[PDB]
């Protein structure tokens, strides 16, 4: 993926996560936990769903056309009828092949981007209280109980409240 | 003292392989099929007015082959010709058969309007044992086999004006005797001639005598032609022998009618898209059932499967 | 002590709606139209040499229908046939009209060169009341109606070599009398015959006698045929009745010449692309005007509007 | 957008910035201001312009072709003539639909990539003398006057000059 | 005290120019060519069975033009017609020549099976000085020019059954005398006739008399027609004059056989793709050699060079 | 490129680099050196090679088709035969033009992304021991000899061993 999050600096996925696409996992004084990020997950899902709908609800009508199977040999005219249909068929087959190729490649990069967005959204929240360990995990340099972590996930985390405590641990 | 918060994404037990720009094989958590590849095997009797030829080709129905009289004036969104259909009337031959089958199929109707004959001097309703109509010798319902009357075949010259507001489809023919004796015996003149014209067109056909393989006992044949008379124009048939007269005309409409060759059973259901393999759902963008299709249908493509990714890349865990 | 510097991007009031891969409806600051959807309603008199058929069809112009003699030796990058064009000469038929109208159109020239054929034994320059060249009777300027002379009509046999370095397009025809009396009266022989051949093509037509609807008073029809004689070859016309002789040939050229059916006025302007609805600009990739085009033209598409985004996404402030 | 800048971690755009696609707004001892980044803006425009020029300076000449409207009914031959044109038309309409769809998506992500590039460019200039507040703003921890702010925008800023002052304010 | 570590990417002295979505000209470190622009100038001898017509067109080989006798019963995956091929037999003309050339080319076999035809009452093996077979007057090998015998020409009526499981391609024709004297002199009847029919079709053709340009000394000409007889059908040939009789049939088959017009030498190599300009590599997606191809071949496109980037962007180095 | 690494925040390229597409160059107490990052380089090469193969190993067979050159003028039927081949040809020429366009645009961003990934992979490794100077170079605030640099390049760098020494230099 272009963003190197998924199948990148984040070793692997979580099969235990079944209620979300992206989420957090901690290990604080109170033990360890796991919660899915609805906001993030929905954003990916909403985009991929639109992507899908631009390709499914659509087909055109064609009634009276040209024959495409023949019981007798005829020559010139028939050759043209077959060439035309065959030419048509390859052009569309090409289009289909290229559509999924492009779409999929973009779908993989998008999901990867959304993961990275969450990581960045988190890093910025934590400010100077945490450090990126390089594996998708942040080392919060201050006692952070379940409540403290929850505020992070729900985005209400107040970095000042812990800055001092944190700065001391970081630079001592 | 310190805490650890890890960000991640999910993965699934068994993912789905998909193709991208940098991989012909890569696994994602979820995907959906874009190629409709299966059929129920039946043709839904509707949105589309469907008509089963059963044993009649659209042409034989048009001409009026006896066992096809049940189709008289039938209409259709989609005519379905069966592979076991057969012809059992008088041996015929149509130059540009394909074109006629096409323009009629497209018209989607067999509405026939009998018009005032005007055959003075000849014997009408000629028939053949090759076209048995019950116990008797019959002929195409929509055609009039003319023969000599009292040792003479007049120099026919009939006119039929098109005073309506729609185009008329006249379909006539000319008969090819098997021998000279037959020729003179049936039409007196040793050489027949049929000329059907309008102010816009004119086609003159000459009979041709000779022996041809027996078909239901007949060595002779009938070559069939057609003429479209536009509103304001008029039809003129001039012949001194061998003419197989029209009995009227077929109304010509434009629409979404068409024809298809298929042995698929016509069940009771609802399917927008019809193929010779049966009906198929049109929720996918592409289909691999058949290139022949009628209605709202996915485009046909060679590929039997195309997966559209619908989830992130699936990364397991050791 | 501190300072605070924020980074940002702009936005605009009335943004623009565009379509993407993940949105069929999303707003951007600016976009440009890619589908030329409009007209001027008129065809520009330039760059392409345009020729208004007016009341004359390219065919009649070629044959030489009296009111079409102004078109003699005319050229055109684009010939323009009008909907009210009419034929004011002798009833004619052309098996394969579409192909003749076509090859002639593509040659884009009506240059006719009169050849010295020598019709010994017949009466020439024949005419009709249905060919009033001026008040008197007449005929297609490029054709020579041949008739008996001194109670006879020779087995005509005239040769005309192609000693030039180019291809000649000869257009001749055969006459179909209304009755036998007419046939024997005009051509003596009871049955006519026309054979035109080169060392490469041979075509022989047989007159066919009958009554056909009156057109400008004539039941008879003339069927028209053409013959291309290549360099180093030679033309041979053999007939003992019913031949409508050639008077020479048409020079055949290759280029970008063509024909179009329209009613669009021809103004004085400059438009590279021409359509039946009039000329239209070619600065956009696509167009929704008419699929019929001539010149450097945007591909026709069903979509009537396609916006190419030319700015970032538009995220207003409230 | 893949980069999550526009319509992302930057809450909304400025209708006031009428001199560019990108810029800065600042609040310092001397006041509050707003410049537009030329270098950045010009780079977005040059790319979208080349992107546009590829799509509109191209048409193909076609003179004598086949007919496409018929006055009478004919059959086999005419059917083929229509199928051909109809077929051709659907395929270009598809090409057109796809063209913009693809193009527009890359166009929205490019403008996002350009915004982000200016941000990382800016962050790297400030070094340790400032922090990313997460709303698209850097809280510069020293007294950065209109001259100091100009040195940052035209890219001349020397992190060494205000380093000490900043660290004092940051880790206190 | 401190260390300095820098990250970077490579670059090349002279890079490669490519086209993107935002640069019709940008430079990369390495690219590969997507369009095959060059041909070897020669046609490989073989994944495909190649047959060089040499001085014979496929037709003349089919008819049996004396010098085309070597191609007797020959087969081919791809027949190669040369620009300098010529005809040295009797002057002929084939209505729908293209279709015959096409169906035989597609069949890819000239296996002529001779049947036992029953021509009672006439003189067989007709010939001319226009088709010398050594010093003597000859005719096409698979044809039988019939003429009068003992002062009469029988109303021929011959039947020939297809009691095989495959289709038979019968190729016959009718002769066009140069004058009436010749007509009666050769066939006795003033007017000839050929009728070749099956239970599925018929083609009743009438001779045409008149003078045509001397070809190899002959005013007259032979028109040529064909007939397919399906397993379970029988061929009936009924003619009282001017028939050019079949001598048997060609066995029809389906495959990948075809025909190409090219002057390109035939060499001993191995190449899947064949163009009139020679054989070419099929490792590239596209090609700009010739739109005419055969075998596993690149889609022809108008562009002569198409670069696919295979390296990052090239940025110099000071 | 969308990532602004190559032909962006990394001024130039290294023509001296012959063993890889990406790499490191240092200066330390022991002197300067240069090494290519195999992991990084191979990742780009592997992707681009797959991208290429999706487009080269593929062509379909067509034998008997329609005529495409004519020696005589015919009219209607020939017009159609030409229109058909011409229509076919333009559609494919367009596909070829768009494929490389798309492919090439995506190939340039991918190579750029892979360069950015390596930078991020390095930044995260160094943690609080170095600072991004803004030109693709990191200023490591502690004596780092050849071995120390090598551990970074092979990804075994232990940030704790130098954290104190570094923190002192950084904030003094
Ligand atoms: C030109 O050649 C053609 C083809 O060879 C030829 O046509 C043949 O004509 C004969 C008779 O004229 C046909 O023979 C009939 O065959 C069918 C079998 O399918 C029988 O039903 C017929 O019945 C006879 O025998 C019955 C005994 O049960 C009797 O009940 C009945 O009364 C008859 O005696 C009869 O045998 C034959 O079908 C065709 N063959 C083809 C290929 O069409 C034609 O005669 C020749 N031209 C001329 C007029 O000389
Ligand atoms: C076969 O049938 C056709 C169709 O009926 C037939 O053609 C018809 O011939 C008659 C003549 O016999 C045509 O009648 C003409 O009608 C037009 C009307 O526009 C008039 O111009 C003609 O005028 C005559 O009568 C006038 C009366 O005052 C005179 O002033 C004038 O001088 C003329 O004498 C004439 O009435 C009729 O138009 C055609 N019908 C069509 C549609 O073709 C044909 O003759 C028949 N075959 C034969 C010859 O037996
Ligand atoms: C209808 O018109 C055609 C075309 O004009 C006409 O055909 C011509 O017939 C004459 C013969 O009657 C052909 O002339 C021959 O030309 C070749 C040239 O290669 C000569 O070799 C032939 O030589 C004969 O005549 C010689 C006298 O000089 C003798 O020495 C010699 O032994 C031969 O007998 C001869 O000159 C001429 O080529 C054709 N023209 C074409 C193009 O066909 C035909 O005669 C006319 N129809 C009728 C029945 O009148
Ligand atoms: C209109 C008419 O004359 N119908 C005839 C029919 C036609 O003459 C025939 O189709 C012309 O091709 O002929 C019918 O007969 C076959 C019958 O003919 C006798 O003459 C003979 O003696 C019998 O052996 C037998 O061949 C027919 O059914 O086609 C009769 C019909 O009345
Ligand atoms: C089957 C047959 O009759 N073969 C003839 C042949 C044909 O009549 C001719 O091809 C018909 O077009 O004619 C041959 O000679 C032509 C020759 O005949 C003379 O008698 C006459 O004096 C010459 O002017 C000339 O017409 C031929 O070789 O073609 C002879 C052959 O036996
Ligand atoms: C549809 O077909 C019927 C035939 O089934 C037509 O009915 C005939 O109408 C004529 C008068 O025009 C009567 O003289 C016949 O007796 C009717 N046929 C019989 C006996 O059923 C009807 O006119 C046709 N009309 C349509 C719907 O096109
Ligand atoms: C759908 O019906 C068709 C018949 O029209 C099936 O038959 C295939 O026909 C093609 C002709 O283009 C042949 O090449 C194949 O050999 C036929 N397939 C087989 C194995 O019978 C076609 O297979 C049917 N498809 C589905 C989805 O059932
Ligand atoms: C965020 O978490 C804190 C601590 O658990 C809680 O008090 C606060 O209400 C949460 N905010 C929301 C609305 O999720
Ligand atoms: C895959 O996505 C589709 C729609 O995008 C959804 O309907 C389907 O349930 C998903 N796969 C599963 C079974 O989770
Ligand atoms: C910019 O955006 C609006 C909406 O697309 C558009 O109509 C306008 O034409 C565009 N600007 C111009 C004139 O190119
Ligand atoms: C028509 O043009 C030709 C030149 O191609 C010329 O010889 C002939 O005289 C012209 N006829 C008229 C009517 O000018
Ligand atoms: C253009 O002309 C056609 C007829 O050829 C007409 O039906 C159509 O509505 C017109 N549309 C435009 C672009 O004005
Ligand atoms: C940046 O701004 C400062 C103060 O305005 C000025 O002195 C300096 O020359 C500027 N640098 C450039 C090249 O714009
Ligand atoms: C590009 O040049 C390189 C040199 O490293 C060569 O290996 C490669 O084959 C060329 N590109 C391709 C994929 O053809
Ligand atoms: C091909 O011609 C030969 C004589 O050269 C003949 O015996 C053979 O039957 C013909 N081909 C076949 C096997 O049908
Ligand atoms: C990394 O470098 C260190 C010091 O030079 C060395 O001891 C270690 O083995 C290297 N690791 C690898 C896998 O190259």
Curated annotation (Swiss-Prot), chains A, D, F:
<protein>
    <recommendedName>
        <fullName>Hemagglutinin HA2 chain</fullName>
    </recommendedName>
</protein>
<feature type="glycosylation site" description="N-linked (GlcNAc...) asparagine; by host">
    <location>
        <position position="154"/>
    </location>
</feature>
<feature type="disulfide bond">
    <location>
        <begin position="144"/>
        <end position="148"/>
    </location>
</feature>
């Amino acid at each position: 993926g272009l963003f190197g999050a998924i199948a990148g600096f984040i070793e692997n996925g979580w099969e235990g996560m079944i209620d979300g696409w992206y989420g957090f996992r901690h290990q604080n004084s109170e033990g360890t936990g796991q919660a899915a990020d609805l906001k993030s997950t929905q954003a990916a899902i909403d985009q991929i769903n639109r992507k899908l709908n631009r390709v499914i609800e659509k087909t055109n009508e064609k009634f009276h056309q040209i024959e495409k199977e023949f019981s007798e040999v005829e020559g010139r005219i028939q050759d043209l009828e077959k060439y035309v249909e065959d030419t048509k068929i390859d052009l569309w087959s090409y289009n289909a092949e290229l559509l999924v190729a492009l779409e999929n490649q973009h779908t993989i990069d998008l999901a990867d981007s959304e993961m990275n967005k969450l990581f960045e959204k988190t890093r910025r929240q934590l400010r100077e209280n945490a450090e990126d360990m390089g594996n998708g995990c942040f080392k919060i340099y201050h006692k952070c109980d379940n409540a403290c972590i929850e505020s992070i996930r729900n985005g209400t985390y107040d970095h000042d409240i812990y800055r001092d405590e944190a700065l001391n641990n970081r630079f001592q | 003292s310190t805490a650890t918060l890890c960000l991640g994404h999910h993965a699934v037990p068994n993912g789905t392989i998909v193709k991208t720009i940098t991989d012909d094989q890569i696994e994602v958590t979820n995907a959906t099929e874009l190629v409709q590849s299966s059929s129920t095997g039946k043709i839904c009797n509707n949105p589309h007015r469907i008509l089963d030829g059963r044993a009649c080709t659209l042409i034989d129905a048009l001409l009026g082959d006896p066992h096809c009289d049940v189709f008289q004036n039938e209409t259709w969104d989609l005519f379905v010709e069966r592979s076991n259909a057969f012809s059992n009337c008088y041996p015929y031959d149509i130059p540009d058969y394909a074109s006629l089958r096409s323009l009629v199929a497209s018209s989607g109707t067999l509405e026939f309007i009998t018009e005032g004959f005007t055959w003075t001097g000849v014997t009408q309703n000629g028939g053949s044992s090759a076209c048995k109509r019950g116990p008797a010798n019959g002929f195409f319902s929509r055609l009039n086999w003319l023969t000599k009357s009292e040792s003479a075949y007049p120099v026919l010259n009939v006119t039929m004006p098109n005073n309506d507001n729609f185009d008329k489809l006249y379909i006539w023919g000319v008969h090819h005797p098997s021998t000279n004796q037959e020729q003179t015996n049936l039409y007196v003149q040793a050489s027949g001639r049929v000329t059907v014209s309008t102010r816009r067109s004119q086609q003159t056909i000459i009979p041709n005598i000779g022996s041809r393989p027996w078909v239901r006992g007949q060595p002779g044949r009938i070559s069939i032609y057609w003429t479209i008379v536009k509103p304001g124009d008029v039809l003129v048939i001039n012949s001194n022998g061998n003419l197989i007269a029209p009995r009227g005309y077929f109304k010509m409409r434009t629409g979404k009618s068409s024809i298809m060759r298929s042995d698929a059973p016509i069940d009771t259901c609802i399917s927008e898209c019809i193929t010779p393999n049966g009906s198929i759902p049109n929720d996918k963008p592409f289909q691999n059932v058949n290139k022949i299709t009628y209605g709202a249908c996915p485009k046909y493509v060679k590929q039997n499967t195309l997966k559209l990714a619908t989830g992130m890349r699936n990364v397991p865990e050791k």
